[PDB]
Design a protein around this ligand. Sequence first.
Ligand SMILES: COc1ccc2c(C)c(CCC(=O)N(CC(=O)O)CC(=O)O)c(=O)oc2c1
Ligand SMILES: [Zn+2]
Ligand SMILES: [Zn+2]
Lengths: 343, 342
Amino acid sequence: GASKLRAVLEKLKLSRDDISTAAGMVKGVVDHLLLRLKCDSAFRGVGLLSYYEHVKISAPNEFDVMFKLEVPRIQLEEYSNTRAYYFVKFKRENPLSQFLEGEILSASKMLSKFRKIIKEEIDIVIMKRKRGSAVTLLISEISVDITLALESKSSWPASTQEGLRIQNWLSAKVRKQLRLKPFYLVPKHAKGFQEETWRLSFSHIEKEILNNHGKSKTCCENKEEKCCRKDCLKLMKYLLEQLKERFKDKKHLDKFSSYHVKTAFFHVCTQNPQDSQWDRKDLGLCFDNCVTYFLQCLRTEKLENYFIPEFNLFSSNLIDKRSKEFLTKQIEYERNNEFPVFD
Amino acid sequence: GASKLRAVLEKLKLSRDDISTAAGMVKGVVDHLLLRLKCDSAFRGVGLLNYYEHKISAPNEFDVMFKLEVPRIQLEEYSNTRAYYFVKKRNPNPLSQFLEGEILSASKMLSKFRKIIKEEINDIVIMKRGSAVTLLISEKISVDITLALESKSSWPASTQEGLRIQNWLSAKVRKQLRLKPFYLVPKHAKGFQEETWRLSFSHIEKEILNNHGKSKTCCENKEEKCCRKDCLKLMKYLLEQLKERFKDKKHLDKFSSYHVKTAFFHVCTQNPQDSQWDRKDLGLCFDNCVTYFLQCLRTEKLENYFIPEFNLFSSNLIDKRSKEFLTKQIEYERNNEFPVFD
Ligand SMILES: COc1ccc2c(C)c(CCC(=O)N(CC(=O)O)CC(=O)O)c(=O)oc2c1
Ligand SMILES: [Zn+2]
Ligand SMILES: [Zn+2]
């Protein structure tokens, strides 16, 4: 019954076309903000990490952008064996020294000035406060979440050593090339709460793996090699967002995000490395297997971060068992009934 | 005689295994040359491009390229040659001491390049008598050093229809590769014009050869072993053994591994599927590579892989008699199970 799936994919592509003008508005504001920010000595190396992303596939007018800032000769200290959260210290003048709180970089000090500079130039289209990762701009009745990210061109942290298990899918050579790219750190407090910590971010790798996703270099570049990998992820994200909207009056689904669906999907890509396992003619079965994998993650309360295998996104310290059970029931309901939430 | 081909590949592997000491020696010398060159104001941004590459049958003979970025470069094509350019946007520019009117003199630049290298090796190596220096390290290792300008601007218009890898390595990869810099190496053209620079894509040729499959996991497991690289090795070895057997007739001095490599890349474009290169078929794959090279020689057509309007086999570059001689020798070798491999 993939035809209803194809209908959803049809209407998602229409809303993407109808938004292209809004993306141009975001580019104009973002470039303007960036020009101002590079005049400040603390944010001289600021730059864009495309130019935008859509955390919510069903909200085409809500944009997400990342501003990166390179931190040379960074030294990381893992917070409380969390594998993903770190204090930032410097090895050796330092343009970020005004942000130190002792020997660690203060995320609170950095965000405070970041928020202030953006406030000064938004001389332009309002700006909204965040609930660390920093501000939400509203543009001409279009919202743009801006995240600040430190960039490190050093070897990835040791907690990633066993992650990104793409060797049998995208190749060991590609894994080597990707792990030579930088990694990013976004301000994120760790749970009272531990402030001044930063969380690893690999959004740039996730984008690369999704847009260059086949074992074949020519996957999806011709008729004989069209796969349905991207469409399966679109439909998984749309399923979660529709369930989150339908049950927004309950607390049960608040903690689930497109990141969980995306992580599960990357694991499915690892389990199913051959392009022939993703023939676009099998979209119905491919999507069902994606849903099924996500459900197994929910039931077992195991969803390893794709880059940091010891970090369990579905730990009961993060999402209570009752919420996963609720999501499990609702997805199983949808699947048994040809996804009424897609109507 | 496919087993004879594997015997050659075996012998070549042992040769390169017994050189990694010599390769480490050139890195030492190359590292010292770069440090001093960087002390010069005109070569401040110099660095390695590759570290050292090889003549497949001469494992103690190394080739290295020193790159130097030239920001806001302006190129003027020389006499419609598609590959050769005068280098000319800004105003006297760390290289202004090398200008001659508005053009960068390759002659001047190469003269300082050699002089700095010559004074440095005297501080430790013999320089042999434009693309630039040959060093003799001890009396065993040769290192050919080429200077290249680097430009991070979009590639010249003469490359627009080149690099036709879309059906093999993908259009996505071609776009990624064409976002990389391009290089210019001092090389005289045509008498001769002495201030021209020739486009170089050595870094792309390396990328394509080492990441060579339609499958990203080509050669990464038993099921996907292909013979692309071994075919290129055997093509180069065949030309080198012929060039050495007939060195004193000089009829083959004009042919180089670059012609072989260019024909090989065209064969890859013609045969884009990894299943066409199954290591089990090495004998037939090599024969087909040889046959393609022979067809290029007979038709006097071997387009540059990056610059399609540049014919490497034009009679302006290689006379008909020389191609006919090489054709005769290769056909003889192929008919007799390649005695020159012995
Ligand atoms: C690369 O290493 C990591 C390690 C961990 C993460 C995590 C935890 C998330 C967020 C998951 C999520 O939806 N949230 C709430 C929850 O945890 O249920 C909101 C939030 O905490 O922001 C993420 O987006 O990326 C991560 C990347
Ligand atoms: Zn695909
Ligand atoms: Zn291969």
